[PDB]
Amino acid sequence: PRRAPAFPLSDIKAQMLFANNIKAQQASKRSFKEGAIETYEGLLSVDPRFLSFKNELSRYLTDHFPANVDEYGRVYGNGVRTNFFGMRHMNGFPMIPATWPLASNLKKRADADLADGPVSERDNLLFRAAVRLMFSDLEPVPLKIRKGSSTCIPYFSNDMGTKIEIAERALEKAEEAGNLMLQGKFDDAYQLHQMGGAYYVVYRAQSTDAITLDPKTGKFVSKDRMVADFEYAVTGGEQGSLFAASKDASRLKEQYGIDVPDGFFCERRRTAMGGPFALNAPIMAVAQPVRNKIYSKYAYTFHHTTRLNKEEKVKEWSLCVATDVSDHDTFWPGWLRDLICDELLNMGYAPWWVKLFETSLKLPVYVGAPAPEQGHTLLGDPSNPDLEVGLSSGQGATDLMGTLLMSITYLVMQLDHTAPHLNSRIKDMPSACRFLDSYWQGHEEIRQISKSDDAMLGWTKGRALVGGHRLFEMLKEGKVNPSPYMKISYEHGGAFLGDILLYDSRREPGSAIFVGNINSMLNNQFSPEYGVQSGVRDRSKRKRPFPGLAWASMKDTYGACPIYSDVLEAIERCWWNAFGESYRAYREDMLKRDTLELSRYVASMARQAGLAELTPIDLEVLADPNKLQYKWTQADVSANIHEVLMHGVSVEKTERFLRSVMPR
Ligand SMILES: [Mg+2]
């Protein structure tokens, strides 16, 4: 059922993805790379004292603070959901091999018994109403670009000036490029305007992953992560194999001379993709206004800031169901891309723009280096984009694509299992739009708070409440999938956007509180995804610009965890044992140094201004801007801080572009 074409790097089709410059050529050829990360300035992730610390701390905390999660996956008591062994990884050393990305998810979806389109006309109206509400009366804003981000295919530039020029040129030529694609001239659109080509596959670390201690043997066991070989990926699973990657770290002693303590493993590696910037720029120019609309008009469902902001909504509910989605991005349906595109056309969106958007979700993928002596292969033909990878992580609107799919999926689940009395309100497009507009503002007896694959579903008092409890029971039993669209289950230890919903003895939302996840504090402080990048002089371009700043926001972020004080004391005691130093004093020094360094980047900040005007969100984001790509948005960050991390194309150029895309 159609194998995807594959081209080696030597092939002209793969060569055309890389411009005639050192950076692009190095990206094409980059071999498998691994090595210890610089966790903090002058500290490697594999430092024997650091690993000794992780061994003592993970064992102590698991022993003294076992998980408090009930039969229904509700967190209570200590606010702990699993053991603390997740920190036991040799950061910077990946599992081998990493997965080859699936070229087609059609078989994957069919085999999981998931629908190949909207099941009913009601569902079709609801998905289409989501498009109408999300993409209608948008306001133009500057096109914001992350500083130090790559333009990927074909230039691989990290220079802001070059990136601004590429983005402005893309907005000027998007119409001509989209019209060429409408004629089936994909090679012309790419050759002339760099719109097309492929996604560039980067493998990112998921620094912490499940590890258990087998009581029978006293040996640690790492969670098996299934990977697809090349044959499996190209055939959509028809041929080839799906097998457990090797997380065994014993190899590091032989290969690198690194002492590996017992129960330490190689990190989970996830596929991530970088989009061709010229194609993403016209998409981002529409995506940002869409986010501004949904986070303002539909703030109830979509705009999530603090633990208290989430708590205020959830406390009003009689039932709160914390859902889990299996492998969201790989299962994301291509029929939804086509439905969205068809609906945008119906709304009066420029057909050339819709074509660029459609093409961004069918694009070939260039596989770099999943393992030593593997990769350097283009999957799919750029002359006719026809892949079904699901949702590409570097597509200009991935957050919105996952949010659109999931918000409707959850609403459909509430309608099907709890609220058949609301079906009469969804008769046609105008009534579907009115209903959805009301539901998204939190005006119905059925409610939700969601972001991509994370959500909490709510029921107030009323007719749907009894159904709500049956649905929760069906999820606990876990024998029947409640959705025809995605694989849905309940979360083992219900949390929403990093905050754990801590229930008391009553196990009711009205007396439950949102608290910071103490395990995430440990993940962020002792298992960062990236090194400090001490060699990158411009800190705003680093993956972790100001790591020291996270110490200042720690009490605000995690202070509400029942075991906060206990964890900090355990850290202090273990760090003294391992380094013969005070961890608290070490972090206070790093905080001071990073605070001083920050003023160099903020125009409004004098030589030694201090953190006085900054919010806890500002500080968490400056230590980890990745939180701005999954947890928060632009409006949540102080304006002067957002400027440290992002730069924009003028609203004059985007305003003109937006006028040409949008209906009449
Ligand atoms: Mg969740």
UniProtKB/Swiss-Prot annotation:
Cellular compartment(s): Virion
Catalytic activity annotation: RNA(n) + a ribonucleoside 5'-triphosphate = RNA(n+1) + diphosphate
Enzyme class: transferase
Protein's GO biological process: DNA-templated transcription; viral RNA genome replication
Keywords tagged on the record: Magnesium, Manganese, Metal-binding, Nucleotide-binding, Nucleotidyltransferase, RNA-directed RNA polymerase, Transferase, Viral RNA replication, Virion
Cofactor(s) needed for function: Mg(2+); Mn(2+)
EC code: 2.7.7.48
Gene Ontology cellular component annotations, sorted alphabetically: virion component
Gene3D superfamilies found in the cross-reference section: 3.30.70.1600, 6.20.410.10, Phage p2 RNA dependent RNA polymerase domain (1.10.490.60)
Example GO molecular function: nucleotide binding
Quaternary data: Part of the packaging complex composed of RDRP, P4 and P7. Interacts with P7.
Protein name in UniProt: RNA-directed RNA polymerase
Organism field: Pseudomonas phage phi6 (Bacteriophage phi-6)
